[PDB]
Curated annotation (Swiss-Prot), chains A, B:
Subunit structure: Homodimer.
Bilayer-crossing regions: none
Task performed by this protein: This protein is an aporepressor. When complexed with L-tryptophan it binds the operator region of the trp operon (5'-ACTAGT-'3') and prevents the initiation of transcription. The complex also regulates trp repressor biosynthesis by binding to its regulatory region.
Family: Belongs to the TrpR family.
Protein name (record): Trp operon repressor
InterPro entries: Trp_repress, Trp_repress_bac, Trp_repressor/repl_initiator, TrpR-like_sf
DNA-binding region coordinates: 65-88
Top-level taxon of the source organism: Bacteria
Subcellular location: Cytoplasm
Record-linked Gene3D superfamilies: TrpR-like
GO biological process, one term: negative regulation of DNA-templated transcription
Source species: Escherichia coli O157:H7
Amino acid sequence: QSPYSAAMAEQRHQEWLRFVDLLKNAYQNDLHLPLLNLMLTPDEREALGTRVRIVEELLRGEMSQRELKNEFGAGIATITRGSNSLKAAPVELRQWLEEVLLKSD
Amino acid sequence: QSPYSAAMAEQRHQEWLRFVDLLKNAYQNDLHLPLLNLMLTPDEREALGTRVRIVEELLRGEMSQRELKNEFGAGIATITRGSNSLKAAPVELRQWLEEVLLKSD
């Protein structure tokens, strides 16, 4: 799989791992300080911390109908956001939270 | 710093590390498969792979004027995107690419 030139994108799906590997390597080396500022964004830090609360309130009993009605009406787009249920294993996600919550406390 | 209750957000800036630590821990344990699907987005994978090329073309000589004129005119918003130059150490970012490029090849 080496057509002489390799600085382009045979399928373009390799640049995704290159970014996941560089970022993954940046989150482990802590040298992403610079990329953290360029990456540091408002809507990003908002949507990020937003998911942390959404999932938290979810188990709490506030998936969105609590304070998520002025952003659409009542989880009319966020609750059914075009995502993957069994195609992504939700029990797998609840399992990770189940590991940090059932850790040992 | 423990006002009895701690399941809220004294400053709300701790939920950012909790997400960076969970994600950082998810990128190292590879168990983020589920979060990868919920996180797997189109504009995200596009903007991500987009930065990989932008920075690449940047050193190549195509910061944006090459194929970045229909998205605004010619890097009129992306080239000056509200970011932090010396407040984030750009030479620090070029240093990281300088480590993966001057690695040993």
